[PDB]
Amino acid sequence: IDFGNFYSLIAKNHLSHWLETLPAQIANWQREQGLFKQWSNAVEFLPEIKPYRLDLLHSVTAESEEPLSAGQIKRIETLMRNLMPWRKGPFSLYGVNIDTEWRSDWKWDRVLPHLSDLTGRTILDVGCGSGYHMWRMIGAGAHLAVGIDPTQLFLCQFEAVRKLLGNDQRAHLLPLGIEQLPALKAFDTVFSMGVLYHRRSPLEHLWQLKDQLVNEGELVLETLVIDGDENTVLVPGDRYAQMRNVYFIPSALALKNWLKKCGFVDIRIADVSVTTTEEQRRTEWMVTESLADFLDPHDPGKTVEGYPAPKRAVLIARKP
Protein backbone atom coordinates (compact mmCIF):
# COMPACT_ATOMS: atom_id res chain seq x y z
CA ILE A 1 0.00 0.00 0.00
CA ASP A 2 1.21 3.67 0.46
CA PHE A 3 2.91 4.08 3.80
CA GLY A 4 3.39 7.81 3.18
CA ASN A 5 0.60 8.52 5.68
CA PHE A 6 2.54 6.81 8.34
CA TYR A 7 5.94 8.29 7.43
CA SER A 8 4.30 11.71 7.49
CA LEU A 9 2.79 10.91 10.89
CA ILE A 10 6.05 9.95 12.63
CA ALA A 11 8.04 12.73 10.93
CA LYS A 12 6.35 15.06 13.41
CA ASN A 13 6.52 12.96 16.58
CA HIS A 14 8.78 10.98 18.94
CA LEU A 15 9.16 8.17 16.36
CA SER A 16 10.73 10.44 13.71
CA HIS A 17 14.10 8.71 13.94
CA TRP A 18 12.51 5.49 12.69
CA LEU A 19 12.61 7.18 9.27
CA GLU A 20 16.34 6.53 9.31
CA THR A 21 15.70 2.80 8.69
CA LEU A 22 12.01 2.24 8.00
CA PRO A 23 11.39 3.53 4.43
CA ALA A 24 14.36 1.59 3.07
CA GLN A 25 13.07 -1.61 4.65
CA ILE A 26 9.56 -1.13 3.29
CA ALA A 27 11.01 -0.40 -0.15
CA ASN A 28 12.77 -3.80 -0.06
CA TRP A 29 9.65 -5.55 1.06
CA GLN A 30 7.51 -3.90 -1.65
CA ARG A 31 9.81 -5.53 -4.22
CA GLU A 32 9.82 -9.12 -2.87
CA GLN A 33 6.04 -9.06 -2.11
CA GLY A 34 1.49 -14.23 -6.26
CA LEU A 35 -1.38 -14.56 -3.79
CA PHE A 36 -0.71 -10.99 -2.65
CA LYS A 37 -2.16 -9.68 -5.89
CA GLN A 38 -5.34 -11.60 -5.13
CA TRP A 39 -5.48 -10.48 -1.46
CA SER A 40 -4.69 -6.84 -2.19
CA ASN A 41 -7.32 -6.82 -4.90
CA ALA A 42 -9.89 -7.97 -2.35
CA VAL A 43 -9.07 -4.92 -0.25
CA GLU A 44 -9.33 -2.51 -3.19
CA PHE A 45 -12.71 -3.95 -4.27
CA LEU A 46 -14.01 -3.28 -0.76
CA PRO A 47 -16.06 -0.05 -0.33
CA GLU A 48 -14.85 3.03 1.57
CA ILE A 49 -17.29 3.46 4.47
CA LYS A 50 -17.13 5.93 7.32
CA PRO A 51 -18.66 4.40 10.48
CA TYR A 52 -21.76 6.28 11.63
CA ARG A 53 -21.35 4.41 14.91
CA LEU A 54 -18.01 3.01 16.07
CA ASP A 55 -17.08 1.10 19.18
CA LEU A 56 -13.45 0.49 20.00
CA LEU A 57 -14.03 0.07 23.74
CA HIS A 58 -16.13 -3.12 24.20
CA SER A 59 -15.34 -4.69 20.84
CA VAL A 60 -14.31 -3.61 17.37
CA THR A 61 -17.67 -2.74 15.83
CA ALA A 62 -18.80 -0.45 13.02
CA GLU A 63 -22.36 0.53 12.12
CA SER A 64 -24.00 2.67 9.45
CA GLU A 65 -26.94 4.98 10.18
CA GLU A 66 -29.21 2.98 7.91
CA PRO A 67 -28.22 -0.67 7.24
CA LEU A 68 -26.43 -1.62 4.03
CA SER A 69 -28.07 -3.30 1.04
CA ALA A 70 -28.11 -7.09 0.96
CA GLY A 71 -25.87 -6.77 -2.08
CA GLN A 72 -23.21 -4.52 -0.55
CA ILE A 73 -23.17 -6.72 2.51
CA LYS A 74 -22.73 -9.77 0.26
CA ARG A 75 -19.86 -7.94 -1.42
CA ILE A 76 -18.08 -7.35 1.88
CA GLU A 77 -18.78 -10.91 3.01
CA THR A 78 -17.38 -12.65 -0.04
CA LEU A 79 -14.48 -10.19 -0.29
CA MET A 80 -13.49 -10.52 3.33
CA ARG A 81 -13.75 -14.28 3.01
CA ASN A 82 -11.11 -14.12 0.26
CA LEU A 83 -8.69 -13.12 3.03
CA MET A 84 -9.02 -16.37 4.99
CA PRO A 85 -7.84 -17.59 7.41
CA TRP A 86 -9.11 -15.01 9.94
CA ARG A 87 -7.44 -15.80 13.23
CA LYS A 88 -7.46 -12.81 15.57
CA GLY A 89 -10.70 -10.92 16.11
CA PRO A 90 -13.64 -10.83 16.00
CA PHE A 91 -14.74 -7.82 13.99
CA SER A 92 -18.30 -6.62 13.55
CA LEU A 93 -18.42 -4.48 10.43
CA TYR A 94 -21.83 -3.21 9.22
CA GLY A 95 -23.49 -6.52 10.09
CA VAL A 96 -20.72 -8.58 8.61
CA ASN A 97 -19.51 -10.48 11.66
CA ILE A 98 -16.11 -12.01 11.25
CA ASP A 99 -15.89 -14.75 13.82
CA THR A 100 -12.19 -15.47 13.91
CA GLU A 101 -10.43 -18.63 15.10
CA TRP A 102 -9.50 -16.84 18.34
CA ARG A 103 -11.70 -15.17 20.85
CA SER A 104 -9.11 -12.43 21.18
CA ASP A 105 -11.71 -10.38 22.98
CA TRP A 106 -11.39 -12.79 25.91
CA LYS A 107 -7.62 -12.47 26.07
CA TRP A 108 -7.99 -8.69 25.85
CA ASP A 109 -10.45 -8.55 28.76
CA ARG A 110 -8.26 -10.79 30.92
CA VAL A 111 -5.07 -8.85 30.11
CA LEU A 112 -6.49 -5.33 30.47
CA PRO A 113 -6.84 -5.04 34.28
CA HIS A 114 -3.16 -5.76 34.64
CA LEU A 115 -2.08 -3.05 32.20
CA SER A 116 -0.94 0.45 32.96
CA ASP A 117 -3.53 2.97 31.81
CA LEU A 118 -3.20 3.01 28.02
CA THR A 119 -4.34 6.64 27.86
CA GLY A 120 -2.12 8.89 25.74
CA ARG A 121 0.42 6.11 25.21
CA THR A 122 2.25 5.16 22.05
CA ILE A 123 2.29 1.38 21.64
CA LEU A 124 4.04 -1.35 19.63
CA ASP A 125 2.17 -4.60 18.95
CA VAL A 126 4.74 -7.22 17.88
CA GLY A 127 3.34 -9.99 15.66
CA CYS A 128 0.00 -8.19 15.74
CA GLY A 129 -1.63 -10.50 13.21
CA SER A 130 -4.89 -8.92 12.05
CA GLY A 131 -4.36 -5.88 14.23
CA TYR A 132 -7.41 -6.59 16.38
CA HIS A 133 -5.68 -5.79 19.63
CA MET A 134 -4.44 -2.44 18.32
CA TRP A 135 -8.01 -1.26 17.70
CA ARG A 136 -8.84 -2.23 21.29
CA MET A 137 -5.82 -0.20 22.34
CA ILE A 138 -7.21 2.86 20.59
CA GLY A 139 -10.48 2.22 22.41
CA ALA A 140 -8.70 2.01 25.77
CA GLY A 141 -7.20 5.44 25.12
CA ALA A 142 -3.89 4.77 23.44
CA HIS A 143 -2.73 7.69 21.29
CA LEU A 144 -1.07 5.58 18.61
CA ALA A 145 -0.82 1.82 18.04
CA VAL A 146 1.74 0.36 15.64
CA GLY A 147 1.86 -3.32 14.87
CA ILE A 148 4.54 -5.22 13.02
CA ASP A 149 3.98 -8.50 11.24
CA PRO A 150 5.97 -9.84 8.27
CA THR A 151 3.06 -12.03 7.05
CA GLN A 152 1.70 -10.48 3.87
CA LEU A 153 -1.93 -11.56 4.46
CA PHE A 154 -2.22 -9.84 7.83
CA LEU A 155 -1.36 -6.56 6.14
CA CYS A 156 -4.24 -6.93 3.71
CA GLN A 157 -6.55 -8.02 6.55
CA PHE A 158 -5.70 -4.98 8.66
CA GLU A 159 -6.00 -2.57 5.73
CA ALA A 160 -9.33 -4.17 4.91
CA VAL A 161 -10.56 -3.45 8.42
CA ARG A 162 -8.98 0.01 8.28
CA LYS A 163 -10.87 1.04 5.15
CA LEU A 164 -14.05 -0.35 6.63
CA LEU A 165 -13.28 1.81 9.65
CA GLY A 166 -13.13 4.93 7.51
CA ASN A 167 -9.38 5.00 6.82
CA ASP A 168 -8.71 5.44 10.58
CA GLN A 169 -5.16 6.69 11.09
CA ARG A 170 -4.73 5.80 14.77
CA ALA A 171 -3.48 2.27 14.09
CA HIS A 172 -1.02 1.01 11.47
CA LEU A 173 0.57 -2.22 10.35
CA LEU A 174 4.15 -2.39 9.14
CA PRO A 175 5.32 -5.54 7.34
CA LEU A 176 8.50 -5.82 9.41
CA GLY A 177 9.90 -8.61 11.51
CA ILE A 178 10.90 -7.62 15.05
CA GLU A 179 14.57 -8.39 14.06
CA GLN A 180 14.61 -5.53 11.61
CA LEU A 181 14.07 -2.77 14.15
CA PRO A 182 16.85 -0.66 15.72
CA ALA A 183 16.74 0.37 19.39
CA LEU A 184 13.90 2.87 18.96
CA LYS A 185 13.35 3.40 22.73
CA ALA A 186 10.19 5.39 22.02
CA PHE A 187 7.21 3.23 22.96
CA ASP A 188 5.35 3.48 26.25
CA THR A 189 4.17 -0.09 26.02
CA VAL A 190 5.25 -2.99 23.84
CA PHE A 191 3.08 -6.07 23.37
CA SER A 192 4.65 -9.32 22.31
CA MET A 193 1.98 -11.97 22.17
CA GLY A 194 2.38 -15.18 20.29
CA VAL A 195 5.87 -14.51 19.13
CA LEU A 196 8.41 -15.80 21.67
CA TYR A 197 7.92 -19.51 20.99
CA HIS A 198 8.82 -18.80 17.35
CA ARG A 199 12.20 -17.19 18.12
CA ARG A 200 15.55 -19.02 17.88
CA SER A 201 16.94 -16.70 20.49
CA PRO A 202 14.46 -16.06 23.34
CA LEU A 203 16.74 -13.79 25.39
CA GLU A 204 17.61 -11.64 22.39
CA HIS A 205 13.92 -11.37 21.64
CA LEU A 206 13.40 -9.98 25.16
CA TRP A 207 16.33 -7.56 24.84
CA GLN A 208 15.07 -6.43 21.42
CA LEU A 209 11.67 -5.80 23.03
CA LYS A 210 13.33 -3.80 25.80
CA ASP A 211 15.13 -1.71 23.16
CA GLN A 212 11.81 -0.40 21.88
CA LEU A 213 10.65 0.84 25.28
CA VAL A 214 11.18 4.21 26.91
CA ASN A 215 12.59 4.08 30.44
CA GLU A 216 9.82 3.00 32.88
CA GLY A 217 7.95 1.69 29.83
CA GLU A 218 5.82 -1.43 30.13
CA LEU A 219 6.27 -4.85 28.49
CA VAL A 220 3.29 -7.12 27.99
CA LEU A 221 4.54 -10.60 27.18
CA GLU A 222 2.31 -13.50 26.22
CA THR A 223 3.50 -16.88 24.97
CA LEU A 224 3.14 -20.64 25.33
CA VAL A 225 4.24 -22.15 28.61
CA ILE A 226 4.30 -25.44 30.42
CA ASP A 227 4.02 -26.31 34.09
CA GLY A 228 7.13 -26.28 36.26
CA ASP A 229 9.74 -24.32 38.20
CA GLU A 230 12.37 -21.75 37.20
CA ASN A 231 14.42 -24.57 35.59
CA THR A 232 11.65 -26.01 33.44
CA VAL A 233 11.74 -25.38 29.69
CA LEU A 234 10.50 -27.52 26.81
CA VAL A 235 11.98 -27.54 23.32
CA PRO A 236 9.75 -29.69 21.05
CA GLY A 237 10.59 -31.74 17.94
CA ASP A 238 9.41 -31.29 14.35
CA ARG A 239 5.85 -30.31 15.34
CA TYR A 240 4.17 -28.85 18.42
CA ALA A 241 0.40 -28.67 18.09
CA GLN A 242 1.23 -29.19 14.39
CA MET A 243 3.40 -25.98 14.34
CA ARG A 244 6.69 -26.44 12.37
CA ASN A 245 9.43 -24.33 14.09
CA VAL A 246 8.66 -24.02 17.75
CA TYR A 247 11.66 -23.39 19.92
CA PHE A 248 11.33 -22.50 23.60
CA ILE A 249 8.32 -23.19 25.79
CA PRO A 250 9.38 -22.29 29.31
CA SER A 251 7.38 -22.43 32.49
CA ALA A 252 6.06 -19.03 33.49
CA LEU A 253 8.48 -18.98 36.41
CA ALA A 254 11.27 -19.74 33.95
CA LEU A 255 10.07 -16.87 31.83
CA LYS A 256 9.95 -14.62 34.89
CA ASN A 257 13.58 -15.49 35.54
CA TRP A 258 14.46 -14.81 31.88
CA LEU A 259 12.95 -11.33 32.05
CA LYS A 260 15.04 -10.51 35.13
CA LYS A 261 18.14 -11.81 33.39
CA CYS A 262 17.48 -9.41 30.53
CA GLY A 263 17.22 -6.39 32.82
CA PHE A 264 13.49 -6.15 33.49
CA VAL A 265 12.03 -5.24 36.91
CA ASP A 266 8.62 -5.50 38.69
CA ILE A 267 7.89 -8.71 36.82
CA ARG A 268 4.41 -10.09 37.47
CA ILE A 269 2.84 -13.31 36.25
CA ALA A 270 -0.57 -11.80 35.56
CA ASP A 271 -2.31 -14.96 34.25
CA VAL A 272 -1.71 -18.58 33.24
CA SER A 273 -4.52 -20.33 31.35
CA VAL A 274 -4.97 -23.58 29.53
CA THR A 275 -6.14 -22.88 26.04
CA THR A 276 -9.63 -24.38 25.57
CA THR A 277 -11.65 -25.16 22.40
CA GLU A 278 -14.07 -22.33 23.23
CA GLU A 279 -11.24 -19.84 22.83
CA GLN A 280 -9.57 -21.33 19.75
CA ARG A 281 -11.53 -23.30 17.16
CA ARG A 282 -12.67 -23.65 13.53
CA THR A 283 -15.15 -21.09 12.22
CA GLU A 284 -16.84 -19.96 9.02
CA TRP A 285 -13.88 -17.61 8.73
CA MET A 286 -11.14 -20.06 9.63
CA VAL A 287 -11.88 -23.52 8.31
CA THR A 288 -8.61 -25.42 8.33
CA GLU A 289 -7.16 -27.22 11.39
CA SER A 290 -7.39 -25.61 14.83
CA LEU A 291 -6.95 -26.49 18.53
CA ALA A 292 -9.30 -29.46 18.78
CA ASP A 293 -7.37 -30.95 15.85
CA PHE A 294 -4.09 -30.39 17.71
CA LEU A 295 -5.11 -32.22 20.85
CA ASP A 296 -4.78 -35.90 21.74
CA PRO A 297 -8.27 -37.37 21.05
CA HIS A 298 -8.00 -39.58 24.12
CA ASP A 299 -6.34 -37.00 26.38
CA PRO A 300 -7.08 -33.27 25.84
CA GLY A 301 -4.28 -32.60 28.36
CA LYS A 302 -1.75 -33.40 25.60
CA THR A 303 -1.01 -32.44 22.00
CA VAL A 304 -1.24 -34.93 19.15
CA GLU A 305 2.53 -35.46 19.49
CA GLY A 306 2.69 -36.18 23.23
CA TYR A 307 3.62 -32.79 24.68
CA PRO A 308 1.49 -30.94 27.27
CA ALA A 309 -1.52 -29.13 25.82
CA PRO A 310 -1.28 -25.45 24.85
CA LYS A 311 -1.17 -23.27 27.91
CA ARG A 312 -0.55 -19.52 27.77
CA ALA A 313 1.00 -17.17 30.29
CA VAL A 314 0.85 -13.39 30.54
CA LEU A 315 3.73 -11.58 32.15
CA ILE A 316 4.07 -7.91 32.78
CA ALA A 317 7.34 -6.12 33.38
CA ARG A 318 8.81 -2.63 33.62
CA LYS A 319 11.90 -1.28 31.94
CA PRO A 320 14.06 0.44 34.54
Q: Which residue, among 197, 192, 195, 198, has the nearest Cα to 123 in the 3D structure?
A: 192
Q: 106 in the Ramachandran plot: left (φ > 0), alpha (ψ -120 to 50) or beta?
A: alpha
Is 178 annotated among the ligand-binding residues?
Answer: yes
First-to-last C-alpha distance (Å) of the chain: 37
Contact between 222 and 192 under an 8 Å Cβ cutoff? The reply is yes
Is 102 annotated among the ligand-binding residues?
Answer: yes
- The number of folded domains in the chain is 1
The method of structure determination was X-ray
Handedness of CA 103, 188, 208, 161 (dihedral sign): positive
Q: Residue 58: count other Cβ atoms within 10 Å of its Cβ.
A: 10
d(CA 257, CA 117): 25
Non-local (6+) Cβ contacts of 142 within 8 A are 118, 119, 120, 121, 122, 123, 170, 189
- Helix then strand count (H, E) for the chain reads 10, 17
Cis peptide before 250 (omega within 30 of 0): no
Is 138 annotated among the ligand-binding residues?
Answer: no
152-164 helix and 35-44 helix, angle to the nearest 10 degrees: 0
Order of strands, sheet of 311-318, starting from the edge strand that comes earlier in the sequence: 171-174, 144-148, 122-126, 187-193, 213-224, 311-318, 265-274
Reported resolution, Å? 2.6
Is 20 annotated among the ligand-binding residues?
Answer: no
DSSP of 27-83, one letter per residue? HHHHHH--HHHHHHHHHHTS-----SEEESSSS-EEE-SS---HHHHHHHHHHHHTT
Which residue range is the domain that position 320 belongs to? 1-320
Is 271 annotated among the ligand-binding residues?
Answer: no
Is 148 annotated among the ligand-binding residues?
Answer: no
Is 32 annotated among the ligand-binding residues?
Answer: no
**Partners of 126 in the beta sheet?**
148, 192
Environment class of 238 (CB within 10 Å of its CB; exposed 0-12, middle 13-18, buried 19+): exposed
Indicate the residue type of 113: P
Is 185 annotated among the ligand-binding residues?
Answer: no
Is 179 annotated among the ligand-binding residues?
Answer: yes
Is 193 annotated among the ligand-binding residues?
Answer: yes
User: In degrees rounded to 5, what are phi and psi of residue 6?
Assistant: -75, -35
Is 88 annotated among the ligand-binding residues?
Answer: yes
Q: Which residue, among 63, 72, 41, 67, has the nearest Cα to 166 in the 3D structure?
A: 63
Contact between 187 and 18 under an 8 Å Cβ cutoff? The reply is no
